[PDB]
């Protein structure tokens, strides 16, 4: 069945979103610090 494929696809999408939020966090750190 493909429940585990669906789960892994959704997980990868969520991880990608979290990468973008961490991208933003570090941009904001640089504005704060420099």
Binding region for its own copies (CB under 8 A): 7, 10-11, 14, 17-18, 21, 24
- Supply the minimum distance, in Å, between the C-beta of residue 17 and its own copies: 5
For the CA atoms of 14, 16, 31, 33, what is the dihedral angle to 10 degrees?
A: 90
Q: Would you tell me which residues interact with Na ion (CB under 5 A)?
A: 2, 4-5
- Supply the minimum distance, in Å, between the C-beta of residue 6 and its own copies: 12
5 binds, among Na ion, its own copies, none (CB under 5 to 8 A by kind): Na ion
Rounded Cα distance, 5 and 24, in Å: 29
């Amino acid at each position: 069945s493909v429940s585990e494929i669906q789960l892994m696809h959704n997980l990868g999408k969520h991880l990608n979103s979290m990468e973008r939020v961490e991208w933003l966090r570090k941009k904001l750190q640089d504005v704060h610090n420099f």
